[PDB]
Amino acid sequence: VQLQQSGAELMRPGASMKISCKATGYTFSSYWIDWVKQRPGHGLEWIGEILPGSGDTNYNENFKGKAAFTADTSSNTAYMQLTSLTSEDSAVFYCARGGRYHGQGFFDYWGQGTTLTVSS
Amino acid sequence: VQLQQSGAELMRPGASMKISCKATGYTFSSYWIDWVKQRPGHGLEWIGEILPGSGDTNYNENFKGKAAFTADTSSNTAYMQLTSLTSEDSAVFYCARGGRYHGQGFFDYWGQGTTLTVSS
Amino acid sequence: VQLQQSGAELMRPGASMKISCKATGYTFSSYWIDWVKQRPGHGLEWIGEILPGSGDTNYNENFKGKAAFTADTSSNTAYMQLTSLTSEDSAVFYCARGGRYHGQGFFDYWGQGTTLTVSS
Amino acid sequence: IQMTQSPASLSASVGETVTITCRPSENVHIYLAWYQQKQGKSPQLLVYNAKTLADGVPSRFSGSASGTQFSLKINSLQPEDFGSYYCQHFWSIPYTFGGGTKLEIK
Amino acid sequence: IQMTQSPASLSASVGETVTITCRPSENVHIYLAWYQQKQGKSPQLLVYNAKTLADGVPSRFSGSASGTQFSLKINSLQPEDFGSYYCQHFWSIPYTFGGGTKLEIK
Amino acid sequence: IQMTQSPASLSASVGETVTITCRPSENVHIYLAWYQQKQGKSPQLLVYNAKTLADGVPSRFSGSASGTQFSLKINSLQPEDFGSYYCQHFWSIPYTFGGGTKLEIK
Amino acid sequence: ILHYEKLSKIGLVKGVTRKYKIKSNPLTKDIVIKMIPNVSNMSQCTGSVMENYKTRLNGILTPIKGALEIYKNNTHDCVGDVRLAGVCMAGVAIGIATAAQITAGVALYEAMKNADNINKLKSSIESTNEAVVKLQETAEKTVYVFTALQDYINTNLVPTIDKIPCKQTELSLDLALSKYLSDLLFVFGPNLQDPVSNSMTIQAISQAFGGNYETLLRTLGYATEDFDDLLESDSITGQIIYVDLSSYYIIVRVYFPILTEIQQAYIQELLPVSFNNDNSEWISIVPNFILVRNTLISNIEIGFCLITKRSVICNQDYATPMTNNMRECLTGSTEKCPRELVVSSHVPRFALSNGVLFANCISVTCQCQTTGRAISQSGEQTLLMIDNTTCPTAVLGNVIISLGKYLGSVNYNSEGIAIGPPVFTDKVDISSQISSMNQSLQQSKDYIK
Amino acid sequence: ILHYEKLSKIGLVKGVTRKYKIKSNPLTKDIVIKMIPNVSNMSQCTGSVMENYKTRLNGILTPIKGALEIYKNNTHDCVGDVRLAGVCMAGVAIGIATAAQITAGVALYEAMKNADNINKLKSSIESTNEAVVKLQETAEKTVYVFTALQDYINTNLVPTIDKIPCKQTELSLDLALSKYLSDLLFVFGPNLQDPVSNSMTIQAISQAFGGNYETLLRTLGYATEDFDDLLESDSITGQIIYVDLSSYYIIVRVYFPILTEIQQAYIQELLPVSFNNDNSEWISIVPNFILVRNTLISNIEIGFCLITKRSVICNQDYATPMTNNMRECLTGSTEKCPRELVVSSHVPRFALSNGVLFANCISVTCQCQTTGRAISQSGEQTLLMIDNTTCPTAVLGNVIISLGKYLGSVNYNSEGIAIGPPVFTDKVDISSQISSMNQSLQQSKDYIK
Amino acid sequence: ILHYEKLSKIGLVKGVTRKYKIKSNPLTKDIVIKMIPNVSNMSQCTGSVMENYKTRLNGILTPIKGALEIYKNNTHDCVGDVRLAGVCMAGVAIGIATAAQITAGVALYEAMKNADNINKLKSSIESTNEAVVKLQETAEKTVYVFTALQDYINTNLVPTIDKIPCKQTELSLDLALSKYLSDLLFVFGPNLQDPVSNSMTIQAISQAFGGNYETLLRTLGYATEDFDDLLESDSITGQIIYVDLSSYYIIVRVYFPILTEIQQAYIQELLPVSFNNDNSEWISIVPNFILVRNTLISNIEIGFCLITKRSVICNQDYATPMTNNMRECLTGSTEKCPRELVVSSHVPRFALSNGVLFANCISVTCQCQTTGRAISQSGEQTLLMIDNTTCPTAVLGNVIISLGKYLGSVNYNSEGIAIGPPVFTDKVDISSQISSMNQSLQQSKDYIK
Ligand SMILES: *[C@@H]1O[C@H](CO)[C@@H](O)[C@H](O)[C@H]1NC(C)=O
């Protein structure tokens, strides 16, 4: 079980990102893929989650609309699309392997972390 | 099984008797206690019977009202009360142990007989 | 099983015949008795059949009314009564033992053949 | 139901077989009892069902039922059998005793 | 139901296999019988069902059914087989006999 | 559901038993997880149910639940345990992480 | 045959003996039921309700006619010979049928001859203005036409045609027709899958006349000897022989059978009485009604038969076979008669037969009025037999009853009896028992292996 | 007593607990039902219909009177001794009877005293001109007479006596009487074999009044505390105590009981839920209603009892015994509870009890609204228990439901369960199972030999 | 799948094949049923009967409203997240419920939105003076109000208000209302324990309109493709969604489903024919209707389903499991098919399938019309198969029938057949058989010990 993320990038404000997380070693269409934010000095912050295959998604209300989730079962890759980047989006973004069912929200495996830099 | 009667007594006409019969050696509340009259020279005569405990009584029509029956289960004693004694009541009175049920009217055990004397 | 027929006879036209067939060796009231005609040079011709006992009869339409069948179970004898003899009735008549049920119409045993002669 | 008991009085010798009968005025079926009474003593139950002996009664006594009439037989009569003999039906209320047959040892 | 029987007459030698056929005008299924008659005698039942031999008939004769037509085969013909051969359907009333094939020993 | 995590920062020596607690603002029952993060690396799951250790985690760590509050105990602290410790409830949407306790090896 | 003494000892007191009667030899009478009223005297307040009613009736009666025409089109006279029978059917065209369907189709073909005569004067049927009308099917035979709602039209709508608004009269006629259809559809709707069969009772058919079968039977006439027994036992049936989709009527052939008493056959009723065994109360599990025919004991489906005081009237033979164990139980082997525990407080505890009282005196207080003392039942006695040889007059609570004499053994109350195995008759408990002995049998087979 | 946790693990979720109520202590009220209307105001339009109607009514009511006179002629006062009872029967003349028949004959004799008073003023009964009429049976007691068709005569035939031809009025009266007889014969016909018994409900008796038992009950008066429960549970019955064949009326004694709650007795309902076992769906085969009386577990014939929110109302004690295997199954031994395979798609797959949801989440998609993730049922779990300790709010499709807290073990979803043997409850399959184990038992006995 | 030849050899002649249809996807229509007539035009002859009627109706309808308000007060919109569902219940307050009750409560909550619109213009509902009245629930949607006894008031009491005494009119109104309540209480009384559920058919609901469901259905409008099949199979149901105790009306949501044919599923009927074995007559104990779904054989509770010519219509899935022994019996293992002795004289002795006649010619006299000779059945033949290859025309008494050709083996009448074990199907005989095998098993276990 390994989750590989896209490389670090620098984006101007008002642009968009398509962060990718490729998952290997397990049935991609079964386990929820969670997405977590971490800016330095403010701790971790849960962005949302997507169930691949079924297309079920759950959103944090502070991030709904700002971020969207998509899944590709053929290539076993989850996508997070960030729209209207601002100075507050300069953070490290992790893709984590959630559970399969209710009460299993702990994150077994994590990605290496995509560092997003935003500046005018 | 023993039935013990009261002693012989002399009574004036118009008086009353309370003849007692104490029964020992068996369940007093089960067996019917029969009462029998015997004047000399005229044979035996059935007065009546009482079932102790339940209070059921059967009366000879020639003696009903003249004689009454009572039972005391605490002391295991049957009582025959004779009212308005006359010269015809000068007879020997027996208490007998009848049966428990229908068709068992034979008298297993008898008392010694209470001799009543009545004279003006 | 033997079927014995009546002797040969000569009859004037317009007369009647009572051909008899006595059956021995089997239950007479069970098996159909068939009657067959054979004039010389014209092949065999089926006259009819009678089931003894039950009285059931089947008739060829070319011979119905001309010939009638009767059965006597007491003497175990079948009869064909031929009425209004003509020159066409000069033929050899056989009694045959048919089957007992449907599909068994083959003739197991035959009579010796009654030769009827008719002349004016 | 009345009892006609026979004989009213009778004298018999020691060792003689004797019979005392009593006829109820109605059919009482099996239900009948024979009691023996002596002078100055309470009656003792001899027979409680028409052919059944009571406990403690010697097999010397016997009871018989002929349907219409009932009888009590004593075989080899003994001097202690003197006294009075009564019969009761206990078939219906009130219970009726017999007239009382007086048996005297001759 | 008519029978067209072939041949009308036939002469065969001793020991020769011969075949006599008869075609009913309608399908009679299994029901067909082959009889042999000689001069001055009643016919004898040879075959009673299209392929079944009767009791007492030697296994020399045989019967065959081709659905549309029926045939009788004699193997190693013998002099006592001369006479006439008839076929009957017994499928429906009235029962119809064949025309009668005349077999003569050559 | 907010987490009040205590202490915010702490320094402990090698081999010393240490305890880090975090109180959710509501009862989350069994569902709580403890993660450890180091500088420049993704967090690692230490404890996934309030008293259950994850696969590959040494038995040195332990988790305890007191109903109202949850705690993580480290026995015989080692230099590789420096970093930040977070707690998550995964009881309800959205999932909330703890404030993050900074543990420094003294 | 049946051992009544031993059956009575286990609580099965013999009851009344009844005769066995079955319907046979029916007579046929043809009637016409017109399913649409004549509204000629009320046509100003008709509106469009009658056209919709006609469409609904056509939709209802089309499948019936289609099912009849299957046998109408495939039955004819026999041109080959009438020596055996005269009704020829085409079994290939019919395809799938039962014996009852074929017999009913034969009867339908026989009734077609009279249906053709009744089909004449169809204009006279269409012009009927009364609830019951008599016409001449032939010069010597009459036919009765019953109109479904003619009395309501004649006495409820026509006399009030001026006192109320015409729209209210139209609406009331509409609800009358709708209620008639609602009553009819329970019988003549899709449930009438097979209109050919002649098992349709006159009570069910009279739903086309509003449930008034008394009018039909009284108008037709009948033999009054067993009329109520014939009627209540579902023996007077009818068959639809013609359906007209233009005049909206049907022709029904009503059958009036007679009751034949089956000779050397009777039915015995057993009154169940609870009996005492091992300080508990039990009831024997045997059939209550036993059919004895030619000294052959069997069961009978008495739920489909009419039970009267003297005889049991059925429309057909309802006998079913009986197990050899139960047959032996009824002939004296009381060890094979199953029994069920009594946990309910409302069960029969005594019964009377020929003046002799069989009572469970452990559970009820039976006393003798002659002496006033109670009657005793021992722990080894299942039941008590009371007659006037021991208690001429018995009291069982609020009733004092004089008793006859028992004609059986005089030692009834002294002889013993063998008691059968306990059972439980609940369906779920039946499944549980099957499971238990299946598992025990599997264990026994495992030990065998 | 009952082990509700283990029963819930196999799909038997506990339901509402109800009380056990039985009728007792009835009060008696006498009414008169006149079966012939008064047509004195329309006698010109009667004709010969009422002579035929009177003949038909006499034929109908003659067997009822003949069956009553069997007990009328053979019951009297006890002249010997009324110390025990006051009603003397002649058991020799009656011959064959049951306990219920004897009790009903006693009640008939008691009601004869009031029937004699009602038999006075018979001319006043015969002259009634209204549907309901009150007269004075005694100076202090009243009697109500109900005429069968007087309303129809008074409001349908008399007011239209001049607006329609008299023959139409006669025909309408004839069909009205015939329809009344058609309704009546279903109840008072040959099916009334035993008119003595007092188990005949007021609804059945009201067919002599056209099915209007509400009028009878309302006119008589009643206690309104449990009137609907008494009426719907077939507890208000009546008995025919007199039949007059000259004036054509009957006298009915209506009984109004009270409902007594059986102390220390209740009835437990078990909601069946399908559970999962070996990739298949099963239903436990146990009784749905279990009667617990004095800590004794038994079955109950619920089909004859009225079920309400709070209590089960019955007219008698309907308890039946239970097998020891099912009794042990209901007390915790779940290995003895039979189960049946589920092949139908329409079965209950979840239930709610005390705010806690027992669901078969293998067959239904149960999710938690709190997190939006589905709830998992493992292959070794028969059922899932959901409460607000793991999922405060559960969604089962179109419904979102908040859940309570389970008061049982906290390890409900982790503990195992022992599963009973499969069964099949079809009657033909029951016979097949009996055949199979009979053959296997015969084989085992053959091996034994 | 099924081995029809071997089944026909033991008397189970194959019958017509039907499709399997189940209701689904219902459409909803709201109606109002007012349970009290408008007597505004006859108020001088009202008296006090209407107040008593109102009190009685309030007592009847109070428990219904109380049972509805349990779900009315505890169901609302979901304010948390409507991503999964939009109907929130309170499972703690409801306490005990089933899946059907929860679904019905959901449907009640959905219908509340239209019930609130219908509760407007309540004064317009109160003032309805006709049996059927149309009003506007919305500007584009209409609602129909049906008054319980308005036609009787309008056409029987109002026009005769001056021709008869006013007291007679009051008494007739009282009797009409009491008869309406008597009809109504059989359905809406204490038996209506659960008014929430939507399994209540329209026929039962129409008792509040006097049994006239045809008026309701016709006025509402429907699709006529399968209307009679929907109606007769108890598929058109309704649910009470509002009860008003001031105006005395109810609001009913009628559901009109469609019939979906279950794909790759059919139902096979087996005509039972008695067969001959060892000089005796037997019938196979095999289910008459077999449901084959996706090549899976099972039983079906066909008593709850409507049987038509082409398909079997049910309101739900009535499939029940089948024993492996009967499944093997239907696939060819005829040694496992139970048989029962025939002691009744009225049993089917022949049947027809695809023009081929299967007859028990031992007990019936079957003959061939072609030759006039009887057809023989030997002692080792259970049945005779007659086709047009051996007897083109068969006579069985009064019927002559032409036959087709058998499509099975040509050696049908020559091949043997294995016969299963005898059984007895009486319930008492079932208990006796269970007792016998239990005792034999106990003896075998005693020998084992
Ligand atoms: C009484 O018993 C006798 C015995 O012979 C019997 O004949 C009679 O019928 C019985 N009668 C009554 C009224 O008990």
Author numbering:
A (entry chain C), B (entry chain B), C (entry chain H): 2 to 52, 52A, 53 to 82, 82A, 82B, 82C, 83 to 100, 100A, ...
D (entry chain E), E (entry chain L), F (entry chain F): 2 to 107
G (entry chain A), H (entry chain D), I (entry chain G): 27 to 475
The authors write:
NiV has two membrane-anchored glycoproteins, the attachment protein (G, also known as RBP (receptor binding protein)) and fusion (F) protein, that mediate receptor binding and entry into host cells. NiV F initially exists as a homo-trimer on the viral surface, where it adopts a prefusion conformation. G/RBP binding to the cellular receptor, ephrin-B2 or -B3, triggers a conformational change in F that facilitates fusion of the viral and cellular membranes as F adopts the highly stable postfusion conformation. Here, we immunize mice with a rationally designed, prefusion-stabilized trimeric form of NiV F and identify ten antibodies that neutralize NiV in an in vitro infection assay.
Antibody 1H1 binds to a quaternary epitope spanning domains 2 and 3 on adjacent protomers. The 1H1 interface includes nine hydrogen bonds and buries 725 Å2 of surface area on NiV F (633 Å2 on one protomer, 92 Å2 on the other), including a buried charged residue. The stoichiometry of the NiV F complex with Fab 2D3 was 1:1 (Fab:NiV F trimer), while the other complexes were all 3:1 (Fab:NiV F trimer). Four antibodies recognize previously uncharacterized neutralization-sensitive epitopes on the lateral and basal surfaces of NiV F, located within domains 1 and 2. Another novel epitope, bound by antibody 1H1, comprises a quaternary interface that spans domains 2 and 3. Ten of the 53 monoclonal antibodies displayed neutralizing activity and of those, nine bound exclusively to the prefusion conformation and one bound to both pre- and postfusion conformations. Antibody 1H1 exhibits binding capacity for both prefusion and postfusion NiV F, suggesting there may be vulnerable epitopes preserved between both conformations. This phenomenon has been observed in the related pneumovirus RSV F protein, which contains neutralization-sensitive epitopes shared by both the prefusion and postfusion conformations.
